[PDB]
């Protein structure tokens, strides 16, 4: 349809959305469901009460915020639809589904059921005439312009190493783990549970995630930096409540490298990435060594990629030239590529029309996805 | 002193059990071992023939380009291999893939054209599903039954990539309108070897029973049955990767302990950490 | 000699590993002059003798085997029980008993049963110790296995800074005899083998047993996972390569769109 195509940056922790041509997603607000916490009494108390955005961040202590995209998979389907209606609202889209073309993005190793249910929304509730569910890693490759690259997302409940080849990854050499900063920050709070901080609300935990994004990093030396005694730098709450930090800031992200801290049946996302690369040809592995792409948001720690480099040096063989690209809109890299592909008018064949859904449902998407 | 006849039997056995593609290389290794080419070739000639027969060697005569799999229903006994797909019998060097002089075969026809239609649909499918190695439907009107012997095979040999995969799918069928039975196997021989040998072998003994109405009518139907068993079993194996990956693995060797946290032998040896009450 | 040795080792890599003992027997019957060379290269699979005086079914290796007399890691009873032979230090004898008990617990931590025996034989600047763990298959199911953990640590203690160089030999075998209908008569044997160095501190809190046990935990999980991901996803790709499920001419148009993607990449870059 002759309208600007909608780009949906399906961020796990921070979801985003926008259009073609643009470089930053037009409308940004994370992935969450903020349900209320009290009962209206005074005339002036708003209604609907499952608010998102300004009211959410504004009244954090008044909204029982929950998260649908658990393990990178939405559980509050209907609520996410309404969050899209929130996007469809005067705030973000001010339009209809039937008007603009839409582009959905995806992570690797996704169950078909989610894609099918999404298509049900897209063509039954929402009625987009030009839409297809794409990937996310190849979109970050569009952003980088690279061809034979390994894309590593960094969200809240998803972590995947995608060894791509010219924008067409081996759909087998890709690895995917559905865990990141959500439980890592929860585990950091668990460190503070030992030292008395079990401030259980998710909005109360959103502040902890603000510390995660703010006062956290990755110390390259594991025990040499962990076993020693820190200085315990202080943090101040929205009111300014003094809370020390300590070693936790780098202790908790070790879970991503040592899943034994939570007992996850993973083996360190770094080794999983090494294995994702190792599921290809040696020369293809060299091409992937030359092109290492990072995505998501958790790629913003001190010594993050540095400790990763050290791990690869201690695990991968010799001559592995770890050429890691470190851009800034790693979250938006997928959005950037979505805007790039959205600018590509070849999408006519790549999309799924409304009648295409009427005749195939999501089977057309499964026949066209890669 | 050990009798060389034991080595003949052991050699023929191991050469029939040789990895796919590395068969001649296995023969070379055994030749480097015994180095008695006479006694070697005694059991090895049958190992060559039998390996081509069970392994379904897709010999392709250049003048016909059939890619006929070698089985027991093709040879004339004197290395001349009949072709159910094009009614020709060609001599074949069992020691190699070398074939020669395809002599035409005046055969049945009451089943040959029928399997040609079946093999046409199967070839159209299989070529869209296989890359190195394809199908060959043998035919025989034995015991008053137009016995369809649908032999299918696939492989790819990448020793550079250190693996020699091999697939075989022999299907047993009898054109007896209407009561017919779609019997079949789905033989696999995966041979990866670098840093840990992966000699994966499996199959799928299946027996269906389709109704024979006509040649082209039930041809694609029989091929569809084979097709679905292939798709289903490959799907089952794909799921088996995950189910074994966690179930079989942790069942034999756990991934994490029962507590899944960490094993500190210091505290374990300290105080005899739990043999007191537990 | 060397030609038969090399062809024998690569042949064992080529031969069906379900008959490794019998294949090696056939190999000795073929060339008995290279018997011990092949025995040294490909060691014996895990055999189990019983320490009757201690009540310990113990694994059989080369080091406990005093000549041809398998030492028990609990009572030092050879098999046949000789008087002198495979003897570690007295402190190492007790430390070996401790390690054997703790590693039987380790075997219970990952196998919940089986037979495991670690053999030690002292030396000055550290020593060498063979670590063995054996477990049967899923007798309750159709899948069968023969767990053969063959490990040898290169204990190299450094008096300076109480660290100790280690290089645990890795070698693990097991069967994947899944005879399920969805799997067919599926069997697989991962005849695995690795090794990697490390210098670990030996202390009252981190002794040799604890050090090596941690490394065992690490190495086993790493190799196991490496197999499960690399090797099994690789075999999955092999499965898809030999037989594709998707019919072609469907993927052709998708590849045409892929070509258009590369075209667009050139349109902008
Ligand atoms: N500056 C930062 N430092 C560390 N982590 C961050 C930072 N910014 C965002 N993150 C993490 O990235 C997550 C954003 O999720 P997102 O990356 O959008 O999911 P996806 O990987 O699906 O795009 C947040 O939950 C947060 O934990």
Residue to mutate among A140, A265, A279, A369, with most C CBs inside 10 A, is A279
- Percent helix, strand and coil across chain B, each rounded to 5? 40, 25, 35
φ and ψ at residue B104, rounded to 5 degrees: -60, 155
> Subunits that touch chain A (at least 3 Cβ pairs < 8 angstroms)?
B, C
Closest CA of chain C from A229, distance in Å: 19
Q: Which residues contact C124 (CB under 8 A, 6 or more apart)?
A: none
Classify domain A137-178+267-333 by CATH architecture: 2-Layer Sandwich (3.30)
Q: Is the CB of A12 under 6 A from ligand 1?
A: yes
Cβ atoms of C155 and C199 closer than 8 Å: no
Q: Which CATH number fits domain A1-136+334-368: 3.30.420.40, 2.40.50.140, 3.40.50.360, 3.40.50.300?
A: 3.30.420.40
Whole-number Å distance, alpha carbon A148 to ligand 1 midpoint, is: 24
| The pair of three-digit structure tokens given for residue A71, joined into one six-digit string | 């393990």
Give the domain-ending residue among C44, C68, C88. C88
- The three-state secondary structure class of B89 is strand
Tokens 């499996």: give the residue. B202
| The pair of three-digit structure tokens given for residue C28, joined into one six-digit string | 């000795």
Kindly list the domain boundaries of chain A, sorted by start residue: 1-136+334-368, 137-178+267-333, 179-266
Q: C42 and C169 in one domain?
A: no
Strand pairing report for C147-154 and C163-173: antiparallel
Tokens 């590395």: give the residue. B22
Name the nearest CA neighbour of B19 among B55, B58, B45, B44.
B55
Same fold, A1-136+334-368 and A179-266: no
Q: Which residues contact A339 (CB under 8 A, 6 or more apart)?
A: A7, A18, A19, A20, A21, A22, A23
In three-state form (DSSP H/G/I as H, E/B as E, the rest C), the secondary structure along A296-349 is CCCCCCCCHHHHHHHHHHHHCCCCCCCCECCCCCCCHHHHHHHHHHHHCCCHHH
Interchain CB contact of C221 with A (< 8 Å): yes
In three-state form (DSSP H/G/I as H, E/B as E, the rest C), the secondary structure along chain C is CHHHHHHHHHHHHHCCHHHHHHHHHHHHHHCHHHHHHHHHHCCCCCEEEEECCCCEEEEECCCCECCCCECCCCCCCCCCCCCCCCCCCHHHHHHHHHHHHHHHHHHHHHCCCCEEEEEEECCCCCCEEEEEEEECCCCCCCCCCCEEEEEEEECEECCHHHEEEEEEEEEEECECCECCCCCCCEECECEEEEEEEEEEECCCCCCHHHHHHHHHHHHHHHHHHHHHHHHHHHHHHHHHHHCCCCCCCCHHHHHHHHHHHHHHHHHHC
Q: Which CATH number fits domain B108-252: 3.40.50.2000, 3.90.1150.210, 3.40.50.2300, 3.40.50.300?
A: 3.90.1150.210
The sign of the dihedral angle between the CA atoms of C141, C61, C128, C39 is negative
d(CA C24, CA B220): 48
Name the nearest CA neighbour of C120 among C151, C165, C81.
C151
Q: What is the chain C residue with the closest CA to B204?
A: C184
Q: Which residues contact C36 (CB under 8 A, 6 or more apart)?
A: none
Which of A166, A267, A367 is closest, CB to CB, to C225? A267
Method: cryo-EM
d(CA A330, CA A16): 12
Q: Which structural domain, as residue segments, surrounds residue C25?
A: 1-88
Q: Across the strands, what pairs with B172?
A: B149, B183
| The pair of three-digit structure tokens given for residue C213, joined into one six-digit string | 């046990």
Could B246 and A265 be called an inter-chain contact, meaning their C-beta atoms sit closer than 8 Å? yes
For B122, C67, C250, C259, the CA distances from B129, given in Å and listed in that order, are: 10, 57, 12, 22
Q: Is the CB of A143 under 6 A from ligand 1?
A: no
CA C47 to chain centre: 14
Closest CA of chain A from B258, distance in Å: 10
Q: Across the strands, what pairs with B190?
A: B200
Q: C181 and C266 in one domain?
A: yes
DSSP annotation of A294 = E
| The pair of three-digit structure tokens given for residue A299, joined into one six-digit string | 């790629």
The sign of the dihedral angle between the CA atoms of C42, C47, C52, C54 is positive
Contacts of B248 in chain A (CB under 8 A): none
Contacts of B245 in chain A (CB under 8 A): none
| The pair of three-digit structure tokens given for residue A177, joined into one six-digit string | 């783990």
Interchain CB contact of C226 with A (< 8 Å): yes
Specify the length of chain B in residues: 278
Q: Which residues contact A289 (CB under 8 A, 6 or more apart)?
A: A277, A320, A321, A322, A323
Give the domain-ending residue among C31, C64, C88. C88
Cβ atoms of A36 and A144 closer than 8 Å: no
Could C229 and A147 be called an inter-chain contact, meaning their C-beta atoms sit closer than 8 Å? no
φ and ψ at residue A316, rounded to 5 degrees: -70, 160
Interchain CB contact of B231 with A (< 8 Å): no
Cβ atoms of C6 and C36 closer than 8 Å: no
Q: What is the chain A residue with the closest CA to C262?
A: A166
Q: Which CATH number fits domain A179-266: 3.90.850.10, 3.40.50.300, 3.90.640.10, 3.30.70.100?
A: 3.90.640.10
Contacts of B161 in chain A (CB under 8 A): 281
In 10 A of CB C63, how many CB atoms?
17
Can you list the pairs that B236-242 forms with residues at least 24 positions away whose Cβ atoms lie under 8 Å? B236/C182, B236/C183, B237/B202, B237/C182, B237/C183, B237/C186, B237/C236, B237/C239, B238/C236, B238/C239, B239/C182, B240/C178, B240/C180, B240/C182, B240/C183, B240/C186, B241/C232, B241/C233, B241/C235, B241/C236
Cβ atoms of A287 and A253 closer than 8 Å: no
Number of domains in chain C: 2
For B27, B31, B49, B53, the CA distances from B92, given in Å and listed in that order, are: 18, 22, 9, 12
Name the nearest CA neighbour of B21 among B136, B184, B164, B123.
B164
Closest CA of chain B from C237, distance in Å: 10
Tokens 């406990």: give the residue. C64
C15: domain CATH number is 1.20.58.570
d(CA B177, CA C41): 60
Name the nearest CA neighbour of C4 among C42, C31, C43.
C31
Could B263 and C209 be called an inter-chain contact, meaning their C-beta atoms sit closer than 8 Å? no
Q: C172 and C93 in one domain?
A: yes
Contacts of B256 in chain C (CB under 8 A): 221
Interchain CB contact of A195 with B (< 8 Å): no
Whole-number Å distance, alpha carbon A35 to ligand 1 midpoint, is: 22
State the closest ligand 1 atom to the C-alpha of A298, by its place in the atom list counted from 1.
Answer: 5
Which of A147, A275, A349 is closest, CB to CB, to C226? A275
Strand pairing report for A102-104 and A131-133: parallel
Give residues after which chain A gaps, C-N over 2.5 angstroms.
Answer: none
**CATH number, domain B1-107:** 3.30.1140.60
Give the domain-ending residue among C88, C106, C124. C88
φ and ψ at residue A43, rounded to 5 degrees: -70, 110
d(CA A170, CA A109): 12
For A217, A243, B221, the CA distances from A214, given in Å and listed in that order, are: 9, 14, 64
b or e along A341-361 (b: 16 or more beta carbons within 10 Å of the residue's beta carbon)?
A: bbbbeebeebbbbbebbeebb
Kindly list the domain boundaries of chain B, sorted by start residue: 1-107, 108-252
φ and ψ at residue B181, rounded to 5 degrees: -130, 125
Q: C166 and C107 in one domain?
A: yes
C104: domain CATH number is 3.90.1150.210
Tokens 């990539």: give the residue. B161
Alpha helices in chain B (DSSP H): 4-16, 23-33, 37-54, 112-127, 215-243, 249-252, 265-269
d(CA A114, CA A73): 7
Tokens 């060389």: give the residue. B4
| Gyration radius of chain C's alpha carbons | 24
d(CA B249, CA B245): 6
Name the nearest CA neighbour of A139 among A301, A331, A286, A305.
A331
Q: Which residues contact C121 (CB under 8 A, 6 or more apart)?
A: C63, C86, C87, C88, C127, C128, C129
| Gyration radius of chain B's alpha carbons | 24
b or e along A18-52 (b: 16 or more beta carbons within 10 Å of the residue's beta carbon)?
A: bbbebeebbebbbbbbbebeeeeeeeeeeeebbbb
DSSP assignment string, A70-133: ETTEES-HHHHHHHHHHHHSTTTT-S-TTTS-EEE---SS--HHHHHHHHHIIIIIS--SSEEE
Interchain CB contact of C197 with A (< 8 Å): no
Name the nearest CA neighbour of B63 among B44, B39, B89.
B89
Name the nearest CA neighbour of C185 among B14, B129, B246, B189.
B189
In chain A, DSSP finds a helix count (H) and a strand count (E) of 15, 15
Whole-number Å distance, alpha carbon C182 to ligand 1 midpoint, is: 41
Contacts of A275 in chain C (CB under 8 A): 225-226, 229-230
Q: Which residues contact A76 (CB under 8 A, 6 or more apart)?
A: A33, A66, A68
d(CA B60, CA B80): 14
d(CA C127, CA C152): 10
For residue A129, count CB atoms less than 10 angstroms from its CB and return exposed for 0-12, middle for 13-18, buried for 19 or more: buried
Element (H, E) at B91: strand B88-92
Phi-psi region of B223 (alpha: psi -120 to 50; beta: other; left: phi over 0): alpha
| Gyration radius of chain A's alpha carbons | 21
φ and ψ at residue B103, rounded to 5 degrees: -90, 130
Q: Is the CB of A205 under 6 A from ligand 1?
A: no
Q: Which of residues 157-186 of B touch A (CB under 8 A)?
A: 161
d(CA B124, CA B229): 17
Q: Is the CB of A67 under 6 A from ligand 1?
A: no
Whole-number Å distance, alpha carbon A156 to ligand 1 midpoint, is: 6
Q: C242 and C215 in one domain?
A: yes
Angle value at C-alpha A94, between A89 and A99, nearest 5 degrees: 115
Interchain CB contact of A85 with C (< 8 Å): no
Contacts of B240 in chain C (CB under 8 A): 178, 180, 182-183, 186
Pocket test for ligand 1, best of A106, A156, A255 (most atoms within 8 A of CB): A156
φ and ψ at residue B200, rounded to 5 degrees: -90, 125
Interchain CB contact of B196 with C (< 8 Å): yes
Q: Resolution of the deposited coordinates, in angstroms? A: 8.2
For residue C30, count CB atoms less than 10 angstroms from its CB and return exposed for 0-12, middle for 13-18, buried for 19 or more: buried
Cβ atoms of C129 and C153 closer than 8 Å: yes
Cβ atoms of C107 and B212 closer than 8 Å: no
Angle value at C-alpha A81, between A75 and A85, nearest 5 degrees: 150
Q: C267 and C230 in one domain?
A: yes
Question: Cα dihedral angle (A313, A315, A321, A324), rounded to 10 degrees?
Answer: -80
Name the nearest CA neighbour of A250 among A226, A224, A223.
A226
For A14, half-sphere exposure in the C-beta direction (CA atoms, 13 angstrom radius) is 21
In 10 A of CB B35, how many CB atoms?
11
Q: Across the strands, what pairs with B147?
A: B140, B174
DSSP assignment string, A32-46: -EEEE-S---STT--
Cβ atoms of C149 and C157 closer than 8 Å: no
Could C14 and B193 be called an inter-chain contact, meaning their C-beta atoms sit closer than 8 Å? yes
């Amino acid at each position: 349809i002759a309208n600007q195509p909608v780009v949906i940056d399906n961020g796990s922790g921070v979801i985003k959305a926008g259009f073609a041509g643009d470089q930053i997603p037009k409308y940004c607000f994370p992935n969450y469901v903020g349900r209320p916490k009290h009962v209206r009494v005074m005339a002036g108390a708003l209604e609907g009460d499952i608010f998102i955005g300004p009211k959410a961040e504004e009244h954090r202590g008044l909204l029982s915020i929950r998260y649908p995209m658990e393990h990178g998979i939405v559980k509050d389907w209907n609520d996410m639809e309404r969050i899209w209606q929130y996007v469809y609202s005067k705030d973000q889209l001010q339009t209809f589904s039937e008007e603009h073309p839409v582009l959905l993005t995806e992570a690797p190793l996704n169950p078909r059921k989610n894609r099918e249910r999404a298509a049900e929304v897209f063509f039954e509730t929402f009625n987009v005439p030009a839409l297809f569910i794409s990937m996310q890693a190849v979109l970050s490759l569009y952003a980088t312009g690279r061809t034979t690259g390994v894309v590593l997302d960094s969200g809240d409940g998803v972590t995947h190493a995608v060894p791509i080849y010219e924008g067409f990854a081996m759909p087998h050499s890709i690895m995917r783990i559905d865990i990141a900063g959500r439980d890592v920050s929860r585990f950091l709070r668990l460190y503070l549970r030992k030292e008395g901080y079990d401030f259980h609300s998710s909005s109360e935990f959103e502040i902890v995630k603000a510390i995660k994004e703010r006062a956290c990093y990755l110390s390259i030396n594991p025990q040499k930096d962990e076993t020693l005694e820190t200085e315990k730098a202080q943090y101040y709450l929205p009111d300014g409540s003094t809370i020390e930090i300590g070693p936790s800031r780098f202790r908790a992200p070790e879970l991503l490298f040592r899943p034994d801290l939570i007992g996850e049946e993973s083996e360190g996302i770094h080794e999983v990435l090494v294995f994702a690369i190792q599921k290809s040809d040696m020369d293809l592995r060299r091409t992937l060594f030359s092109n290492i792409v990072l995505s998501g948001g958790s790629t913003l720690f001190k010594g993050f990629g540095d400790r990763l480099l050290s791990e690869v040096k201690k695990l991968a063989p010799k001559d592995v030239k770890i050429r890691i690209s470190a851009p800034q809109e790693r979250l938006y890299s997928t959005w950037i590529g979505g805007s790039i592909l959205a600018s590509l008018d070849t999408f006519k064949k790549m999309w799924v029309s409304k009648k295409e859904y009427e005749e195939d449902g999501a089977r057309s998407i499964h026949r066209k996805t890669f | 002193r050990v009798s060389d006849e034991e080595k003949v039997r052991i050699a023929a056995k191991f050469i029939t059990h040789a990895p796919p593609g590395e068969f001649n290389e296995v023969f070379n290794d055994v030749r480097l071992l015994l180095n008695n080419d006479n006694l070697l070739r005694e059991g090895a000639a049958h190992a060559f023939a039998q390996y081509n027969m069970d392994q379904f060697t897709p010999v392709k005569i250049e003048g016909y380009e059939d890619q006929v799999l070698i089985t027991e229903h093709g040879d004339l006994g004197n290395s001349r291999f009949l072709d159910p797909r094009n009614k020709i019998s060609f001599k074949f060097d069992h020691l190699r893939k070398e074939a020669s002089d395809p002599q035409p075969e005046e055969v049945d026809g009451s089943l040959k054209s029928w399997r040609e239609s079946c093999d046409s649909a199967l070839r159209a499918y299989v070529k869209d599903h296989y890359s190195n190695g394809f199908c060959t439907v043998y035919a025989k009107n034995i015991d008053g039954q137009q016995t369809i012997i649908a032999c299918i095979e696939s492989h790819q040999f990448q020793p550079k990539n250190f693996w020699n995969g091999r697939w075989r799918s022999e299907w047993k069928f009898t054109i007896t309108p209407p009561t017919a039975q779609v019997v079949g196997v789905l033989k696999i021989q995966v041979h990866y070897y670098e840093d840990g040998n992966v000699q994966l072998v499996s199959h799928k003994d299946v027996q269906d029973s389709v109704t024979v109405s006509n040649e082209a009518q039930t041809a694609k139907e029989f091929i569809k049955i084979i097709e679905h068993a292939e798709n289903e079993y490959q799907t089952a194996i794909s799921e088996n990767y995950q189910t074994m990956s966690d179930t079989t693995f942790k069942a034999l060797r756990r991934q994490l302990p029962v507590t899944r946290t960490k094993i500190d032998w210091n505290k374990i040896l300290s105080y005899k950490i739990g043999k007191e009450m537990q | 000699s060397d030609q038969q040795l090399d062809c024998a080792l690569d042949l064992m890599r080529r031969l069906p590993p379900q008959q490794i003992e019998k294949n090696l027997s056939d190999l000795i019957d073929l060339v008995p002059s290279l018997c011990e060379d092949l025995l040294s290269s490909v060691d014996q699979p895990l055999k189990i003798a019983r320490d009757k005086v201690v009540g310990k079914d113990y694994l059989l290796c080369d080091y406990n085997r005093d000549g041809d007399s398998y030492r028990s890691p609990w009572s030092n009873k050879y098999d046949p029980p000789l008087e002198d032979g495979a003897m570690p230090s007295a402190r190492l004898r007790k430390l070996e008993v401790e390690a054997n008990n703790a590693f039987d617990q380790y075997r219970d931590l990952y196998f919940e049963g089986g037979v495991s025996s670690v053999y030690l034989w002292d030396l000055d600047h550290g020593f060498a110790g063979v670590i063995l763990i054996k477990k049967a298959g899923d007798g309750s199911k159709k899948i069968k296995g023969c767990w053969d953990s063959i490990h040898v640590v290169e204990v190299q203690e450094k008096s300076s800074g109480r660290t100790a160089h280690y290089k645990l030999t890795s070698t693990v075998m097991l069967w994947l005899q899944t005879n399920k209908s969805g799997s067919g008569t599926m069997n697989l044997g991962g005849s695995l083998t690795r090794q990697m160095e490390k210098d670990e501190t030996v202390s009252d809190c981190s002794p040799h047993i604890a050090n090596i046990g941690r490394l065992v935990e690490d190495m086993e999980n790493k190799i196991r996972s490496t197999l499960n991901e690399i090797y099994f996803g690789k075999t999955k790709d092999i499965v898809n390569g030999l037989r594709s499920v998707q019919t072609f001419a469907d993927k052709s148009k998708q590849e045409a769109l892929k070509n258009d993607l590369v075209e667009a990449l050139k349109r902008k870059q």
